[PDB]
Structures are given as C-alpha cells and as structure tokens.
Amino acid sequence: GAMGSMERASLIQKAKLAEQAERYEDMAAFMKGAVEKGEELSCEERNLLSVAYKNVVGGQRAAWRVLSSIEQKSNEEGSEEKGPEVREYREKVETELQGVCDTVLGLLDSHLIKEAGDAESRVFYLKMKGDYYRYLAEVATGDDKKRIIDSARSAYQEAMDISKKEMPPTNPIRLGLALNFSVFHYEIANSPEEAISLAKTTFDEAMADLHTLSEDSYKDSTLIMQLLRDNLTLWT
C-alpha cells in the first residue's frame, strides 16, 4: 500500500483537504490507506470513505453512460461503421469502474463488515456493499450477471433487516438505504412496483416519526424523505 508509511490521522486530515480541493481520487486513496490501518472507522470517517468513492465512481458511471449511448447509436441500422474504438474506450472506462467497485468491496470484505457490530456502522457498510454491487450490475452482461444482482439484493436485504430492528424509521442511514434499495428494484431488478412500494412505505413511516426529532435531526431526515418523494414523482 502506497499509504502504508503515512499516519492514520494524517491520512484522514489529507482526505478532508482533498475534499475541500475537490480531489476525490486523492480523497479515496487516502481513505483506502486509512481503512488499511486495520482499525474500525468512526462515523465521520465512514462518511469520508463513502463521499470519496461515490464521487469517483459517479464520474465513471456518467462517462460510461455517455460512451454506451454513443456505442448504441453506432450499432443501429444505417449507422456508419466507426471501427472498434467506441467499444474499446467504453470497455476501458468499464474496466476502471469495475476496478473501483472491486476495491471498495474488497475493503468491506477485508475487514470492515466483519468488525462492524453497531447498527450505524454495519447497516452503512452493507448499504455500501449493495451500492457497489449495483454499480457492477449496471455494466454487467456475462454469465455472472444474475449473481451480481443477487449479491446486491442480499447485502441490501441484510442491511434492511438490521435497520428495521435497530434504527428508528427517520434514521438517515436507514432512509438512504431504503432510497437506494428502491432504486435497485426499479432500475436493476425490473421490479418497479416493489420500488414504489418501498419508497412509499419508507416515506410514510418516517413522516410518522418526525415528531420525535430535534430541529437538526428533522432537517437531515426530511432531506432524504424529499428524495424518496422525488423518485415517487418520477415513477408515477
């Protein structure tokens, strides 16, 4: 590990500087180094890890979608044959994206999840596992596609089961998990009715628990509730 000689605290500090500088690849490399120190991550550290890799993979996904659309146009009837280049470059971006996902999943399996006992850590990491298998599923076409989808589903479902037993319905981790699992159902599993049902039930159960919250907690929860409503509006 290129970060093996850097102090854990210095890696965390530099991840925060990289965030301020919008250097998300650096941020992710610093947080990977911090994870590889072997200690559990605090709440703030878990979110630094997720912010970093979400920005990296998000850029890769956006680029993959542009290239995939170009490739699809180049393959329809009447199109001029442009050679192997579009496929090759889409494949390059896809392989890099898969590499990022494999790296995140590797950190979760070695050994973040197995040491995560509190709901706020374990649900967060299982949500991340579902998310990164979902990103793999977005680009998957081979013999293992169904297994990739099922790996995402299984991780999301374990996270859901814990979240329902161990967190209030307004907990922002629980809400974001449900939001993302709902998108998994809609976009990956071809289950739009399950997606809509999950978003609606999550929103309504959160609404009913808002009365228990402080002003700051209310803001955190209602922000994600609005994303649930935004998706419901898109889908109905």
């Binding site: 998310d131 974001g176 939001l179 993302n180 998108v183 809609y186 976009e187 994600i224 994303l227 935004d230 998706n231 898109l234 889908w235």
Partner: peptide, 5 residues
C-alpha cells in the same frame, strides 16, 4: 436518473 445517496 433517480436519486440515490
């Protein structure tokens, strides 16, 4: 695309 966090 739909919203995720």
């Amino acid at each position: 695309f739909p919203a995720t966090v």
